[PDB]
Amino acid sequence: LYRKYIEYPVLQKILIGLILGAIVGLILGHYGYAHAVHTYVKPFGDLFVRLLKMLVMPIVFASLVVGAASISPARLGRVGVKIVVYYLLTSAFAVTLGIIMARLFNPGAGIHLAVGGQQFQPHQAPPLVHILLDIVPTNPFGALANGQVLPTIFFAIILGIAITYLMNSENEKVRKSAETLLDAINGLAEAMYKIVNGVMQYAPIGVFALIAHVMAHQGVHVVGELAKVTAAVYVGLTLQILLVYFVLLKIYGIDPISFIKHAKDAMLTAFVTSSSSGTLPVTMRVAKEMGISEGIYSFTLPLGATINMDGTALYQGVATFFIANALGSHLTVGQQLTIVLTAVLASIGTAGVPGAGAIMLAMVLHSVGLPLTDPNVAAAYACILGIDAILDRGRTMVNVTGDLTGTAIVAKTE
Numbered sequence: 001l002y003r004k005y006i007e008y009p010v011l012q013k014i015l016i017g018l019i020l021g022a023i024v025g026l027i028l029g030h031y032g033y034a035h036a037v038h039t040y041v042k043p044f045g046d047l048f049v050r051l052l053k054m055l056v057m058p059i060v061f062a063s064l065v066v067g068a069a070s071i072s073p074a075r076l077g078r079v080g081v082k083i084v085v086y087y088l089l090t091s092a093f094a095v096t097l098g099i100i101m102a103r104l105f106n107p108g109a110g111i112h113l114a115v116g117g118q119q120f121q122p123h124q125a126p127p128l129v130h131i132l133l134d135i136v137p138t139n140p141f142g143a144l145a146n147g148q149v150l151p152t153i154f155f156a157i158i159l160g161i162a163i164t165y166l167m168n169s170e171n172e173k174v175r176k177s178a179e180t181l182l183d184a185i186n187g188l189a190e191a192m193y194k195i196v197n198g199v200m201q202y203a204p205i206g207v208f209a210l211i212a213h214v215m216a217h218q219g220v221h222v223v224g225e226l227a228k229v230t231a232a233v234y235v236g237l238t239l240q241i242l243l244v245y246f247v248l249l250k251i252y253g254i255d256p257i258s259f260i261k262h263a264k265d266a267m268l269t270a271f272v273t274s275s276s277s278g279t280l281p282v283t284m285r286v287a288k289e290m291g292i293s294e295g296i297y298s299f300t301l302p303l304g305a306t307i308n309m310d311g312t313a314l315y316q317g318v319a320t321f322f323i324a325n326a327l328g329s330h331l332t333v334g335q336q337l338t339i340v341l342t343a344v345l346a347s348i349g350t351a352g353v354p355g356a357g358a359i360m361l362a363m364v365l366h367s368v369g370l371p372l373t374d375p376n377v378a379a380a381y382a383c384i385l386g387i388d389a390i391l392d393r394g395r396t397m398v399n400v401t402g403d404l405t406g407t408a409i410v411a412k413t414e
């Protein structure tokens with residue numbers, strides 16, 4: 001029944017793997033068979049970790065190039081300024097709210113990951129001058145091949161901006177050559193998102209092996225911590241709607257009660273599909289009967305479907321704290337502010353494809369000194385990606401909801 005396995009829903013598939021993973025570890029580990037799990041069940045979980053790390057490098061480079069080549073055009077108009085400034089402010093405030101939830105609920109506190117029998121000891125910090133000057137790569141190819149992600153981000157952003165200037169050039173041969181290069185890079189990004197969909201089909205098997213191995217060694221309190229981070233994200237998402245969207249709507253005069261009733265179809269549709277790109281046709285229909293002018297929502301909505309992601313920004317702030325707390329490290333004031341800047345940039349480049357927001361988490365992990373090369377970081381990294389399907393549902397609703405409420409405010413003031 002191979003076809004039956006594929007057609008079965010992914011979220012219900014992961015939940016089955018997690019429940020049986022806990023049961024197997026407890027009963028088998030109680031009878032003094034812990035080494036059997038480590039020798040046999042662990043290798044099936046190591047494949048999931050290695051598969052996740054492969055997708056990190058091609059996705060970051062390709063998505064940033066195409067993302068930077070679309071919002072670069074300065075000429076937008078008068079309705080193209082209010083929507084842009086609103087998008088940046090909402091994304092920045094989402095990260096701050098996520099930090100508050102992480103510092104309040106304190107997820108991941110109690111477990112000490114010691115993969116390889118070595119506690120995570122942070123390396124000595126080089127001088128700030130060296131760190132800032134190391135962002136510029138000496139060899140753009142070398143940064144991509146060696147796995148350095150901070151130089152990769154800088155080169156991708158400038159390359160995308162330069163492509164935009166070429167497409168507006170007067171010469172016909174230069175314009176044709178610039179469009180071909182962008183399409184080739186665009187086709188690489190789209191091909192990688194299909195691999196992400198195929199990797200998550202193996203996720204229920206990978207989650208089963210990971211949970212079973214950790215259940216027989218670090219007891220049961222690990223599962224309790226996973227519940228705290230799941231509750232922390234959804235609590236923060238709820239406060240995002242009531243304390244930001246509802247307040248702004250009431251201030252400008254738009255009735256929140258009428259807003260939710262007229263936009264319920266979009267939110268539930270985005271919830272089940274977990275995609276903000278396939279929900280766009282549904283979003284276009286909803287705004288029509290609301291009263292928005294045809295021109296207003298024909299420009300902001302396509303732009304906001306890939307730029308305005310408040311849920312992803314809140315998710316990345318909470319997830320980073322969970323990994324650091326599990327490792328036993330401490331976040332300084334300067335490092336926390338670095339999250340507020342890196343998470344906003346990472347959310348802009350994130351694509352609407354489901355599951356693409358946990359691949360950009362590596363951008364903020366490296367920015368705070370937690371590389372994926374460290375075995376301890378990688379083990380904890382795959383722990384939060386295992387339950388990503390559960391968290392992917394809620395965050396997609398907030399991303400779509402921000403686009404609708406942003407359009408209404410602009411349309412109110414014309």
Ligand SMILES: N[C@@H](CC(=O)O)C(=O)O
Nearest residue numbers: 274275276352356357399
């Ligand atoms: N699924 C989200 C993207 C993400 O989770 O990163 C969306 O469609 O907006």
Ligand code: NA
Nearest residue numbers: 087090091308
């Ligand atoms: Na935003």
Ligand code: NA
Nearest residue numbers: 304305308399
């Ligand atoms: Na969005």
Ligand code: NA
Nearest residue numbers: 306347348350
């Ligand atoms: Na995005």
